[PDB]
């Protein structure tokens, strides 16, 4: 409040301005060595206790009068405590710098004791900066079923420090944002043309009808509705040939499945594929 | 105590103020080079031994008189020891800075010997800052069964440096707070619409009745009471088809289960599902 | 706007230039100690509130007039908020430096409170610099199916901070660029002469016809069309001899396969190889 | 010793004070440029060799006279060697700073050569600070069977740098304290209401009597003495249904077991549970 | 261009040199406080806009005239953008330092905002320095089939930041050079006297003929051509004795195999070894 | 040698002291700007080439005269090379600081080029400081069979940088000391009351005699000589009940076994336990 | 060359010394503000282009005249390029410091742009310092078959940055030296009294003859020649008792085996042990 707090803050620096310092030129060691360390030494000592009144009138204005603020009560009552040590740290650290008493000895205990809280606020401040860069980069939105670190889930909320995303067990995970600027984000809702990589083991003991099984499965997959063909072709090749079988890794490429249309297709592709395998008189394998 | 400690602290700087320095202008090298290094050199040397009396009268006022303080006795008796080296470090480090003796040689052994304890207090101070950010971000409360790093447990206490949460074995884990600003917090009590991902292997050898099993299991799951349907549909599709079977991954989505209502449902969904499988004359699979 | 914002910015420094400071030589402590801390103290205090008008007229010029800018609306409305704390930080940090009030006490809270955001912007700024080095080094292009960390996918987009590459499940992964300057990038589209490393177990119980199987498989592989021979020779040697079998690790080297020509060859090489094995009357092994 | 060491330390600075410097005002370059670099250059050079006598009279006073000190002999004989390089480093680093010879060139080899031992003492000093924070935070006491990193053991000793805790093999592990401020501490002796999570596979082939087995096991567990019921209910639900069986995950919640009362209960709960399973005519499963 | 760009760069500092500053000694605050902050303040302000013309005439000289330079077009068009912010950063950061306006407030936003890009360019600059040390240390050449981190491949190219090496699947891996100064490089082409470590399980049930099998296999291996014997002897000892067998770990040491001469030997050593095992009437084991 | 090296070192600074500088007051720019940059500029330039003679007379005094020193020859011949670049670095870095030529430009290439070797000597200097803290903390002695990181072995030697401990294969491991201040040290020779955690599977199919087996095994273990009972009781409970068996985890607590008395007890406890199991007519299990 | 390069380097500073600066006292702003910024500004500007001639006459003296130097040609031709940017960096960084133009703005772009290459040369310079500490600590020699990180091999070469050691596959691994000051070095050639830890499963079904098997195996092992007994006794105890067997972990301690004497003993100890087992009529186990 710039209309009601400057009275003991600024009127008591107009006081020490006029009463003792400016009007009075008393020659008993008060000009050469006290005119500068008691104006700047007293502007600061009554600008720190300006900011203490501008700060602790967020006690009167925000929590006492308004209904606990735009924060909560326990959030703002420890904010009028962690901003009262960062105001005493700048208060003693600037009031000792202007009074000339121990200038570069309190600045080195408060520039090193204040870089201790910069070595240590690399996690919470890294989350603030990475969550500040998620607003520019935009990897996801409020519905995208992303995954950072096997943290598959749809994004509930996007905060500054932590985005909360609702897990595969429908548990609201609260991912810190520094896991988004240092890790892979597999965004799974801005995804068109999804894919199948299934595998069917099959007991042949023939090893020569199997290019016709591998041809007719491809002829199933490219003559399938809701299958995308502009990207990679539907592949069905064999691998892992053993004493009795050869497992065919069926691959296909769907188009914009909605997760209940998806599993009907991942079911019916594999079932129709097994129908084509049983058409050639060969049963399925033991793995 | 600003009413009873300034006597040998501040009366002996009013002493060296008036007796030797201010009133006396003795010309034998006492003004050009001793007026400033013995006022600021003696304000500081009797402000450090002010803070030593304000500090060691927390011995008389807190532990000797009051019942061992708001800390314990062994907490505050090593606090009147770790604050007596941070007062001798600022005492020699400011008393050597005002006396001009070795200014930037003690400041570089105490600004580097004091950043050794800032390289090293990145764990305990990181826990203080991350536990100070848990008050603003609020990932959990005193009942939330969260997990940070396979550290599943309900939160007993929320401290500055370590929140203690009671484990799955009902052992009170004491998680440091820097595991909350750098890691995922799967908060499991602000969770509505929980889910089932079960799997049922089933020996068919038919592979063509199985869309009717996969349809009738879905018709069980969406006609089930206490099952949420506004989010993802109850899915029952097959995967991993082999020589004799196909395992059906039954998925469902419950609503706000209370962990004893939960397992009755995760039991009866799977039992009723097996009843529907045995209705179609197919038994369960070998995995 | 250098034609319409300097009026209250620069005309009110020509004001305090001429009106009070330059023309007026009033001897009541206004020259020795106020001529420099109120010109540079007021150039800066009306150059910060120049840049506040040049900055908040990107509100009028970019989002209000033009259609939300070359950024979006929510991108530029938090850019006129994160550039208004970096202008108040340089505003108080330079306005306190020119006014001489607490010079090296606000510079040490803003050079340490501004290196807190340099300890912490090592992820987002590391992504900017590594994505700035991807433009010079060029590991990949817009079609290259690269992989950084089991992150196999063709590159959709190449941004500053994150390149997005479409995964093996055709999910648009959004890889941060610092995973490209610190990790291996297996670029799989600037690849000629691809290879096969297959394995065929085979029940012999002879262990002496097997150099003729290993010779005739090599004679298959080097007399194969679309097989590259200028690099490593097509090898077929045995390993892992056991109670009944010896698995032959067939290796070959193809030439510039197009991923649907590829698996036809990886099929027919192994099938023709099994035809050569069954020509020598030995069946395949149990692994 | 402030009564017997100042003789060659301080009497030879009263010597160079009176004999050559203070009383003598010889005009051959001895006042303008030698009065300050040979008082502060000789106070320091006879305050370093004060601290060398106060330091090496811990040789006479502590190890030679007293029985090897409160440390050992090999501890204090290398402490009068690592404090004689930190006194020669501050001795040359302050004696070169007061003599003006190479001020900011020895301070930059001793403020950088002394931050080499601050980059490197982040492990031992991190253990000192984290073990100094274990006195305030108090995660455990001298009997608590804690575990930090699969380091299960009861705490023998709690030092500054390393707490030693006696392992599960009854080997005295010596955990560094920085593993307590950066890692989870599962304190297992301030634990009330311990739990059972057992599993019983059981060959049913019925799948319809099993809600009565799951009801009667719960009726065993809540009608059990020394079982806590104010927290989570005793659950017995099925999971992992397969070709012949369904494994029932029996859970229960005991009360303050003393590790030999515990395993009698974890035995008799599972035995009585198997008695209830064999009461319903179904045998146990194959897993 | 030092023959055609200094005209508006340097002729307009000879202008402000002669016209206003040097020849003119106008006494209206232009000598005591403007002679130094407007020569060095205007040398710099017309040396930055010298380097802007020397820089943006790499636009005219390199890309517009010559065919897109020794870089590409998109490489050099973002190089005339990332060198125009490092010239505006040094331009405002030196032009504000010479004009005296906010000296140590812009230097602390540009020495800390420029060490943000030194905390962050530790990956790309680490690759430049480690790839600059690969030229001195020389771990490999353009044909060496090295491996850093299971990154087996022959080295295609050796760049500054990334050496590209063609993988075991003949995919051109692009390894960053900091994986060569911090990790093991198994250089496999400057390798003489390669080795075999094979294993043969063998069903004996005798356990007493086996020193003669282990002697005759060694007599095979040292009487083998292309086998090196100056280093370690060819060993054949048993290990892992079980119910029926004992697996003999045959070791040998070849000489400078060329990868197709190699596998013929690794085949024929094991085949001849099995011939010696079948000579003693014992068949091979089950593992 | 302070009796024979100061002749060209210190006599040539008494030379430039008296001959040119002190006695001669020649007014041709030799007092205002050359009296200080050529005394301190020549004290240093003949104190660096004092330390070069005090350093390279460790060539004459230590290796040439004495038998290669208390180090070896190859140790001290590279110590008169790595101390001749740290003397040229302080020689040019202080000789350029006193001569005033480029003071803060060589100090910033030698305070940053000398903190490059402080970023990098965090491993070797961390080993020196952690091995300097092993002398105070004392985790082990010269016979203690400790383990740091699955590095089980008895400690042969305890150096400054690396303690060498003889492995479980009796290979002298050379552990760096920074693995002792950052990792767990399971000291296994200051261990009293060792333990057994054995397991016996046993085919019962009774599940009701097994509290008498679990009682009689405990009655064996507490009536056993050389078994400690003041700590945890000898436990024998069952776990992992399956189709036919229940494995009993026998635990016991021995007393100060000497590793050949140990395994006789770990043998005879399990054998006597199996005798008690076969007394109750039940054989051992399949696991 | 201090006899032929100082002509344009030093004769053109004797030129600007005598011709314009020293002899000429022209009063047109050439003494107060140009006498110091153009002597030190021109000593440096003709000492940098002294070192450019002393540097680029390693082009004439080393590679052009001598046969490509003690380095190679490609090593020294990029050394006359990476020392020509560290001479232009110190050239502009000191020439801008003496000319006074932008002193603390180029020093902060070259003390921060030169600590970017100190954040980044922590790998190559860490290898130089750790390989410089391998000369003092001496963990190994040129024949020692050491292992750092499963990097078993005999040491071929010991460089500054990387020691190359020939692998178990006889591939010359090139280990960086920072893997020796931060990791365990199991030096396996300064090893006396090697050991055996073998295991023999054995089908007993007796469980009472087995102390006589465990006694007679020990009587074999201590009555064995080339077996060391001054350290740990030869142990043979049982563990892992199951349905039919008990595996006896035979341990022994050999003496200074030479790797072909070794495996004959590790063979014959196990064979003789199996002979003693078959003497007691019990066959070997199934594991």
Burial E67-79 (b: 16+ CB within 10 A, else e): eebeeeeebbeeb
- Closest listed residue to residue C186, CA positions, set C148, C229, C133, C241: C148
Give CA torsion, residues A11, A17, A23, A28, to 10 deg. 130
* Furthest C-alpha separation in chain C: 117
**C-alpha distance across the termini of chain C, in Å:** 77
Q: What is the DSSP string of G134-147?
A: HHHH----TT-EE-
User: CA Rg, chain E, in Å?
Assistant: 36
Nearest 5°: CA angle at G155, between G154 and G157?
150
- Distance separating alpha carbons of residues G82 and G61, to the nearest angstrom: 18
Q: Contact C44/E101, CB-based, under 8 Å?
A: yes
DSSP E strands, A120-269: 145-146, 153-158, 162-167, 172-176, 185-186, 195-197, 202-203, 236-241, 246-253
- Distance separating alpha carbons of residues E61 and E55, to the nearest angstrom: 10
Cα E130 to Cα B10, E135, F107, G176, distances in angstroms: 61, 9, 25, 12
Which residues in chain A touch residue B190, judged by CB atoms under 8 angstroms apart? Answer: 172
* Furthest C-alpha separation in chain E: 117
- Distance separating alpha carbons of residues A37 and C101, to the nearest angstrom: 11
Report all structural domains of chain A as residue ranges with CATH numbers, in order of start.
6-119 (no CATH), 138-181 (2.30.30.60), 195-284 (3.30.70.100)
Sign of the four-CA dihedral D125, D130, D135, D141: negative
Burial B48-57 (b: 16+ CB within 10 A, else e): bbbbbbbbee
Specify whether the CB–CB gap between C263 and A237 falls below 8 A: yes
With a CB cutoff of 8 Å and minimum separation 6, the contacts of E135 are G74, G75, G78
Structure tokens at G162: 């990387």
Half-sphere exposure of F36 (CA within 13 A, CB side): 14
- Distance separating alpha carbons of residues B268 and B262, to the nearest angstrom: 10
Structure resolution in Å? 3.3
- Distance separating alpha carbons of residues B94 and B107, to the nearest angstrom: 8
By 3-state DSSP, what share of chain G in percent is helix, strand and coil, each rounded to 5? 45, 15, 40
Nearest 5°: CA angle at F42, between F41 and F45?
95
Counting one residue from E and one from G, how many pairs have CB atoms under 8 Å apart?
178
Cα A152 to Cα B195, B236, F199, distances in angstroms: 14, 20, 40
Q: Is C169 helix (H, G, I), strand (E, B) or coil?
A: coil
Cα A257 to Cα A139, A152, A265, A266, B250, distances in angstroms: 21, 18, 9, 10, 19
Q: What is the DSSP string of D153-178?
A: EEEEEE-SSEEEEEETTS-EEEEETH
Q: Nearest 5°: phi and psi at F132?
A: -80, -25
Q: Which residues pair with D241 in a beta bridge?
A: D246
Q: What is the DSSP string of A183-219?
A: S-EE--SS--S-EEE--B-EE-S-SSSHHHHHHHHHH
User: CA Rg, chain C, in Å?
Assistant: 36
Q: What is the DSSP string of G256-278?
A: S--SSHHHHHHHHHHHHHHHHHH
- Distance separating alpha carbons of residues B210 and A155, to the nearest angstrom: 34
Structure tokens at D284: 């146990």
Q: What is the DSSP string of G41-94?
A: HHHGGGTHHHHHHHHHHHIIIIIIITTS-SS-HHHHHTHHHHSSSHHHHHHHHH
Q: Nearest 5°: phi and psi at B50?
A: -85, -50
Q: What is the DSSP string of E28-92?
A: SS-STTTSSTTTHHHHGGGTHHHHHHHHHHHIIIIIIITTS-SS-HHHHHTHHHHSSSHHHHHHH
Closest approach of chain E CAs to the CA of G201, in angstroms? 6
Give the full edge-to-edge strand order of the sheet including E236-241: E195-197, E246-253, E236-241
Q: Contact G105/E117, CB-based, under 8 Å?
A: no
- Closest listed residue to residue C107, CA positions, set C95, C117, C119: C95
Cα D123 to Cα D129, F117, F123, F169, G93, distances in angstroms: 10, 19, 11, 30, 37
With a CB cutoff of 8 Å and minimum separation 6, the contacts of B163 are B131, B134, B155, B157, B174, B175, B177, B180
Burial G192-212 (b: 16+ CB within 10 A, else e): ebbbbebbbbbbbeebeebee
Cα E102 to Cα C6, C44, C63, distances in angstroms: 20, 8, 32
Nearest 5°: CA angle at A10, between A9 and A11?
100
Structure tokens at G26: 């022209």
* Residues followed by a gap in chain A, C→N > 2.5 Å: none
- Closest listed residue to residue C245, CA positions, set B119, G28, A242, F243: A242
Closest approach of chain C CAs to the CA of E171, in angstroms? 5
Neighbours of B263 (CB within 10 A): 19
Neighbours of C263 (CB within 10 A): 19
Query: Among the residues of chain D, which ranges form H helices?
Result: 6-15, 40-43, 48-58, 73-77, 79-82, 86-98, 103-110, 116-119, 124-137, 178-181, 210-222, 261-279
Q: Contact A193/C200, CB-based, under 8 Å?
A: no
Query: Which among C105, C123, C200 has the least Cβ separation from residue A107?
Result: C105
What element of type H or E holds B274?
helix B261-279
Q: What is the DSSP letter of A232?
A: S
Closest approach of chain G CAs to the CA of E67, in angstroms? 26
Query: Among the residues of C111-227, which ranges form H helices?
Result: 116-119, 124-137, 178-181, 210-222
Which residues in chain C touch residue E170, judged by CB atoms under 8 angstroms apart? Answer: 191-195, 231, 253
Classify burial at F241, counting beta carbons within 10 Å of its beta carbon; exposed 0-12, middle 13-18, buried 19 or more: buried
Helices (H) and strands (E) in chain F, counts: 12, 10
User: CA Rg, chain B, in Å?
Assistant: 36
- Distance separating alpha carbons of residues C278 and A208, to the nearest angstrom: 11
Q: Contact G231/F268, CB-based, under 8 Å?
A: no
Q: Is C262 helix (H, G, I), strand (E, B) or coil?
A: helix
Q: Report strand pairing: G195-197 vs G246-253.
A: antiparallel
Residue with tokens 């196990």: G270
User: CA Rg, chain A, in Å?
Assistant: 36
- Closest listed residue to residue D193, CA positions, set B154, G188, A264, C212: B154
Q: Contact C108/A93, CB-based, under 8 Å?
A: yes
Q: Contact G97/F103, CB-based, under 8 Å?
A: yes
- Closest listed residue to residue C144, CA positions, set C163, C127, C131: C163
Counting one residue from B and one from D, how many pairs have CB atoms under 8 Å apart?
188
With a CB cutoff of 8 Å and minimum separation 6, the contacts of G135 are F74, F75, F78
User: Which residue does chain B place closest to D131, by CA atoms?
Assistant: B124
Burial G76-102 (b: 16+ CB within 10 A, else e): beebeeebeeebebbbebbbbbbbbbb
With a CB cutoff of 8 Å and minimum separation 6, the contacts of E130 are E177, E178, E180, E181, E182, G123, G124
Cα F109 to Cα C115, F45, G117, distances in angstroms: 22, 19, 11
- Closest listed residue to residue B63, CA positions, set B81, B47, B50, B46: B81
Neighbours of F1 (CB within 10 A): 11
Structure tokens at B62: 């807190």
Closest approach of chain B CAs to the CA of D62, in angstroms? 22
- Distance separating alpha carbons of residues F112 and G115, to the nearest angstrom: 6
Q: Nearest 5°: phi and psi at B82?
A: -85, -10
Q: Is D270 helix (H, G, I), strand (E, B) or coil?
A: helix
Query: Which among A90, A191, A241 has the least Cβ separation from residue C105?
Result: A90
Query: Which among C44, C129, C237 has the least Cβ separation from residue E267?
Result: C237
Q: Nearest 5°: phi and psi at F145?
A: -90, 70
Closest approach of chain A CAs to the CA of C82, in angstroms? 9
Q: What is the DSSP letter of F46?
A: G
Which residues in chain E touch residue G201, judged by CB atoms under 8 angstroms apart? Answer: 242-243
- Distance separating alpha carbons of residues A195 and A175, to the nearest angstrom: 28
């Amino acid at each position: 409040f710039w209309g009601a707090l400057e009275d003991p803050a600024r009127y008591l620096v107009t006081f020490i301005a006029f009463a003792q310092i400016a009007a009075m030129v008393a020659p008993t060691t008060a000009i050469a060595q006290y005119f500068s360390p008691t104006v700047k030494g007293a502007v600061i000592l009554s600008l720190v206790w300006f900011l203490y009144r501008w700060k602790t009138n967020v006690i009167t204005r925000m929590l006492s009068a308004k209904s606990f603020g735009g924060l909560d009560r326990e959030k703002v009552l420890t904010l009028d405590k962690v901003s009262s040590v960062g105001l005493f740290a700048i208060g003693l650290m600037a009031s000792a710098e202007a009074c000339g008493v121990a200038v570069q000895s309190i600045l080195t205990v408060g520039g090193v004791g204040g870089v201790a809280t910069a070595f240590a606020a690399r996690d919470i401040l890294g989350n603030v900066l990475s969550g500040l860069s998620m607003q520019f980069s935009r990897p996801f939105s409020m519905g995208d079923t992303i995954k950072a670190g096997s943290v598959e889930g749809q994004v509930i909320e996007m905060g500054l420090t932590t985005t909360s995303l609702l897990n595969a067990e429908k548990f609201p995970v609260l991912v810190p944002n520094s896991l988004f600027s240092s890790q892979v984000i597999v965004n799974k809702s801005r995804a068109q043309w999804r894919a199948i990589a299934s595998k069917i083991p099959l007991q042949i003991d023939d090893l020569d009808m199997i290019p016709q099984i591998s041809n007719e499965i491809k002829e199933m997959l490219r003559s399938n509705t809701k299958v995308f063909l502009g990207k990679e072709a539907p592949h069905c090749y064999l691998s892992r040939v053993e004493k009795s079988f050869a497992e065919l890794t069926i691959g296909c490429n769907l188009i914009r499945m909605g997760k209940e249309e998806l599993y009907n297709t991942q079911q019916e592709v594999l079932l129709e594929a097994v129908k084509i395998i049983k058409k050639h008189g060969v049963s399925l394998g033991t793995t």
